[PDB]
Design a protein around this ligand. Structure first.
Ligand code: FAD
Ligand code: FAD
Ligand code: O73
Ligand code: O73
Ligand code: ZN
Ligand code: ZN
Lengths: 230, 230
């Protein structure tokens, strides 16, 4: 049984350092005989706003719109915007989903928040009950590959930004873990623009080297204790 | 003299609990004689994607598009999209910026993440000389007013979601403190959709009640020990 990789990619510039780590994951994965699919949100002009256009049928309650309620209802009736349902097809068949993005404001760029807000609806990705260890996308792995402007040092418990695990919490636990993904260790490439030309190639190389053995890696424990300590 | 208030609002429905907390704030700040302005991002169809369309005229480097560099440059040359400089106008004049939003995936809805990404550009909200306490929006207060699906208990230090202070970290410190804002204690309305009609009536009353005394409040210490420590 061959492996399936979905990369959700969020950068404007294919020549960018994020474009490079994306190309090198497609390369290393393609080589190993993985089936690969890239969601290039910018190039697709992916829609980020969560609005009533996301739904094709009669609304449940047409006079007071409620996104959570209508999308969950639309999922069940098979009436989501096809752009959503296309993403959900990619996620359903992926064994692994890689997120490739530059950190914006300690988080994901809005276009990518949009993908998460819109793709991971109730009924598809989780249910109540049916979240955390019981989320609907259980059996799947996720990994964030994040580029930052801050250095390794800025990102320590003692530096100006606090530890890097601090900002991972909403993404890794609050989103991915909530939906049933197991989460591999993140790939964080610090300050590529401040790095020298060779340290840059090294960071890219270290990501290729890492992917050669990714089917062997085990999931982080995705808990408060991993992220925060005490 | 006189105080100015920008409210950044992100919900799709006026009859919503967020809309009600928004109307309440406008009425009560208005009553104290504040200058009030509302950005209703959904009603404005606010653009969340950070693209090259954000810079008017010709780009500083056509070739390789760096969002960061082009917007910094375009801030100086006074050629950013009017939608952005309009928001920059409103933030400039404001003394308190209140964000009103439903929590989406331990963070702000994407449309609101687009406002931060695009409005809070280098040269306007921060520079290298000028971040955290030196941020370029120093002077100003910020308050996150957020609603949730999860109960207050789900958001304790040992509940399934972890403490609510953990998800505030990228917003309050990573974004607002970074830009120089002093941060007021967040208003968190837990689970209004679970809460009874009277609990709801009381969370609106607490909020108007808080709005009558806001200018007396001391800002939080926006530190790691506040967010994660004990
Ligand atoms: C709106 C916004 C919010 C932000 N918030 C934060 C924040 O909260 N925290 C933080 O730390 N940062 C933040 N940043 C900074 C941002 O995360 C970094 O600018 C980004 O991660 C760098 O990634 P890049 O892909 O843009 O690098 P690039 O801009 O592409 O730069 C890397 C350089 O390396 C070169 N390069 C590309 N590929 C290779 C390769 N194969 N080998 C050698 N060289 C190569 C390119 O020519 C390029 O000039 C923010 C930025 C913006 C715009
Ligand atoms: C994409 C997405 C991601 C999400 N991620 C998270 C998450 O990560 N964590 C989490 O906890 N939740 C999450 N949620 C849930 C979400 O945060 C809540 O559903 C939302 O906060 C409820 O706020 P609301 O304004 O939309 O409520 P509303 O649905 O409008 O409900 C409030 C209730 O009060 C009523 N009401 C309106 N005005 C008043 C008033 N004047 N006085 C009394 N009652 C009034 C309404 O009729 C309604 O009955 C997510 C939701 C979505 C859609
Ligand atoms: C260490 C850190 C950085 C470092 O960023 C940079 C900036 C420029 C270059 N360059 O041109 O070579 C390299 C790194 C940055 C941030 N933080 C914490 C940040 O928080 C926001 C940035 N840019 C934000 C622009 C936002 C609104 N449009 C940013 O560059
Ligand atoms: C504790 C928690 C909740 C609680 O949800 C709710 C919402 C409403 C009611 N109600 O009125 O009876 C009860 C529980 C929710 C989430 N989390 C952590 C979440 O992450 C996403 C939700 N809704 C998303 C719907 C999918 C749209 N893309 C959600 O309701
Ligand atoms: Zn977790
Ligand atoms: Zn802080």
């Amino acid at each position: 049984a061959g492996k399936k990789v979905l990369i959700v990619y969020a950068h404007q510039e294919p020549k960018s350092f994020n474009g490079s780590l994306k190309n090198v994951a497609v390369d290393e994965l393609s080589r190993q005989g993985c089936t690969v699919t890239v969601s290039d949100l910018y190039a697709m002009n992916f829609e980020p706003r969560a609005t009533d256009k996301d739904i094709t049928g009669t609304l449940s309650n047409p006079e007071v719109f409620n996104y959570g309620v209508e999308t969950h209802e639309a999922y069940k009736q098979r009436s989501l915007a096809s752009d959503i349902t296309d993403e959900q097809k990619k996620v359903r068949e992926a064994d692994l989903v890689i997120f490739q993005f530059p950190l914006y404001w300690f988080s994901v760029p809005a276009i990518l928040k949009g993908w998460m807000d819109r793709v991971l609806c109730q009924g598809f990705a989780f249910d109540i009950p049916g979240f955390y260890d019981s989320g609907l996308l259980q059996g799947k792995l996720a990994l964030l590959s994040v580029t930052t402007g801050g250095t390794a040092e800025m990102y320590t418990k003692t530096g100006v930004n606090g530890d890097s695990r601090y900002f991972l919490w909403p993404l890794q636990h609050g989103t991915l873990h909530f939906c049933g993904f197991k989460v591999l260790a993140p790939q964080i490439s610090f300050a590529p623009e401040i790095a020298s030309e060779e340290e840059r190639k090294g960071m890219v190389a270290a990501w290729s080297q890492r992917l050669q053995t990714i089917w062997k890696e085990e999931p982080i424990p995705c808990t408060a204790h991993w992220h925060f300590g005490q």
